[PDB]
């Protein structure tokens, strides 16, 4: 019953890695705010770039989350 | 004596303006750092 | 490139059978100074030179040793 314990602790460790995606999404949307305040006539393209950056950062975060779930359930 | 056989002491003798002010500046480099 | 062989073909070549007498000449010469003890009249300049030549032929012996064991760094076994 040590594999179960290790799966719990390793899944917690694995899901630690979502902090990076959180901070990266914060950075992407803060820079969206700044770049829209400077050039409010590029709103659509700036939002497109923000969507792309958020998608990639959350992709890394979800990679961490799915490694966690793989350890926790799929071994 | 040509300047390639010359010592700093020989220059302080030939041009007394080049001598360092060891009394106004007692410590190395014996001059203002901007002068350097 | 090719200058190395141009120099080697004069002194870095095996001794021809014609000068093996000349060789032993010098050899006896040396032991002749070892016969009497006159080697002390050799100033340390040529003494050092002869020591360097002897170290060189010893390095020749050791390169022969490494070609006789088919391995550079020590004995592979």
């Amino acid at each position: 019953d040590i594999d179960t314990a290790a799966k719990f602790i390793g899944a917690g460790a694995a899901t630690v890695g979502v902090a990076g995606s959180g901070a990266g999404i914060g950075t992407v949307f803060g820079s969206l705010i700044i770049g829209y305040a400077r050039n409010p006539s590029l709103k659509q393209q700036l939002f497109s770039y923000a969507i792309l950056g958020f998608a990639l950062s959350e992709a890394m975060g979800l990679f961490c989350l799915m490694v966690a779930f793989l350890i926790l359930f799929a071994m | 004596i040509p300047f390639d056989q010359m010592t700093i002491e020989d220059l302080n003798e030939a041009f007394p303006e080049t001598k360092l002010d060891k009394k106004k500046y007692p410590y190395w480099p014996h001059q203002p750092i901007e002068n350097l | 490139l090719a200058t190395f062989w141009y120099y080697a073909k004069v002194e870095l070549v095996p001794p021809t059978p014609a000068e093996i007498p000349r060789a032993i000449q010098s050899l006896k010469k040396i032991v002749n100074s070892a016969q009497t003890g006159s080697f002390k009249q050799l100033t340390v300049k040529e003494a050092v030179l002869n020591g360097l030549v002897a170290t060189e032929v010893l390095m020749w012996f050791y390169v022969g040793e490494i070609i006789g064991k088919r391995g550079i760094i020590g004995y592979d076994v």
Partner: protein
């Protein structure tokens, strides 16, 4: 960690004090920059 062995510590302190505080400074004192001629 050989840096933690305090037995060889004076051997590291004593020459440095002679090198940093005496010899390097005696060589810098002989590095002089005269004033420019007129």
């Amino acid at each position: 960690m050989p840096q933690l062995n305090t037995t060889v510590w004076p051997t590291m302190i004593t020459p440095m004090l002679l090198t940093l505080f005496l010899i390097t400074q005696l060589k810098m004192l002989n590095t002089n920059y005269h004033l420019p001629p007129s």
